[PDB]
Amino acid sequence: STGSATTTPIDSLDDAYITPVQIGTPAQTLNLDFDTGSSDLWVFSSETTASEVDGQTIYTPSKSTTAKLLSGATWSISYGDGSSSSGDVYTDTVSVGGLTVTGQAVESAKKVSSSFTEDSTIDGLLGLAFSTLNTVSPTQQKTFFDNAKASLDSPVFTADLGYHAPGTYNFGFIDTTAYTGSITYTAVSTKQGFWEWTSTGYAVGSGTFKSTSIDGIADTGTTLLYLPATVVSAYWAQVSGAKSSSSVGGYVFPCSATLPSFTFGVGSARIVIPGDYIDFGPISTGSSSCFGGIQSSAGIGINIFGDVALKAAFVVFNGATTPTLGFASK
Ligand SMILES: CC(C)(C)c1cc(CC2(N)COC2)no1
Numbered sequence: 001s002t003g004s005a006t007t008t009p010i011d012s013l014d015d016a017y018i019t020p021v022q023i024g025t026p027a028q029t030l031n032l033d034f035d036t037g038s039s040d041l042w043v044f045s046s047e048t049t050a051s052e053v054d055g056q057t058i059y060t061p062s063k064s065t066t067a068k069l070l071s072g073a074t075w076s077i078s079y080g081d082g083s084s085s086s087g088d089v090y091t092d093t094v095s096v097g098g099l100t101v102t103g104q105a106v107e108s109a110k111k112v113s114s115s116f117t118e119d120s121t122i123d124g125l126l127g128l129a130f131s132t133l134n135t136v137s138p139t140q141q142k143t144f145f146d147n148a149k150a151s152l153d154s155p156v157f158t159a160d161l162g163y164h165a166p167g168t169y170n171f172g173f174i175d176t177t178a179y180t181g182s183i184t185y186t187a188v189s190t191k192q193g194f195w196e197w198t199s200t201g202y203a204v205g206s207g208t209f210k211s212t213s214i215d216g217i218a219d220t221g222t223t224l225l226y227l228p229a230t231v232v233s234a235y236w237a238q239v240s241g242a243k244s245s246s247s248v249g250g251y252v253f254p255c256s257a258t259l260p261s262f263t264f265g266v267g268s269a270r271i272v273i274p275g276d277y278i279d280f281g282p283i284s285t286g287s288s289s290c291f292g293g294i295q296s297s298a299g300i301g302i303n304i305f306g307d308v309a310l311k312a313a314f315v316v317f318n319g320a321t322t323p324t325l326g327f328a329s330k
Pocket residue numbers: 037038039077078079080081133219300302304
């Protein structure tokens with residue numbers, strides 16, 4: 001089997017991407033944030049504290065004839081930005097782009113933090129990291145991908161995110177019309193539960209390529225590109241007037257600037273992030289200071305190849321017995 005679904009930026013800046021997901025019987029369609037950096041499928045629901053729901057579409061398990069309470073199971077998650085959610089768990093039928101999993105753990109939110117409430121466009125998350133990160137207790141649950149894997153034509157999914165445009169998540173097959181040249185595959189470590197790999201280096205604009213190992217994770221659920229301070233300093237040094245601002249919380253630059261591209265290495269291959277991809281617009285409405293799409297990972301503990309990097313490529317998440325990652329230009 002295979003699945004194929006369009007993913008759409010939630011706003012003009014590509015701050016996140018949402019993908020329609022069918023849950024339950026009859027189908028209830030929610031727009032979820034596909035996140036290769038976590039491993040819980042959780043949704044706004046009829047159980048979510050009323051004051052914490054503001055415009056989201058909710059899952060109502062009592063209206064699904066295939067929903068079953070997973071007795072005694074609870075979940076609680078906190079993300080890198082300080083946001084959080086928690087609740088209980090149902091199993092139900094979940095379909096993505098024509099691909100159906102029965103008995104999927106659907107984590108129903110009783111509580112969500114303010115940042116989730118404030119984002120009316122995201123009805124929940126669908127985690128695509130490794131199932132070892134799933135927060136369901138006392139019995140850990142599998143991801144949608146993990147559950148689907150045996151039935152898929154090939155044990156893979158691919159991320160094809162658009163720049164200011166829709167893109168595609170495919171399951172079970174590689175669309176050879178969706179990229180240019182060849183796909184370069186690279187080793188993955190699952191030891192932290194992430195799609196963790198090692199980039200071979202970087203270049204800034206037309207500058208010379210610096211060969212250097214950069215360990216990080218392929219994370220669709222993170223908007224920006226977070227890299228070592230040395231690397232990030234080298235990038236923003238090429239932009240007149242750019243600077244790190246503690247009050248804003250990262251590198252900003254004059255909105256009148258033309259940003260240089262950023263190249264990252266995948267083995268011997270190179271993925272080029274165009275300058276425009278790195279512009280995340282005025283820090284506040286009407287400001288002439290713009291927020292940068294490449295930021296320091298110094299205060300994170302890990303480097304993160306988020307959407308800024310991933311949208312520049314066709315990305316293969318290969319979930320074979322030994323998982324790997326593939327990158328192609330497009
Ligand atoms: C910023 C990173 C490290 C990617 C991240 C991921 C998360 C969510 C989890 N706690 C890890 O899987 C569940 N919180 O921070």
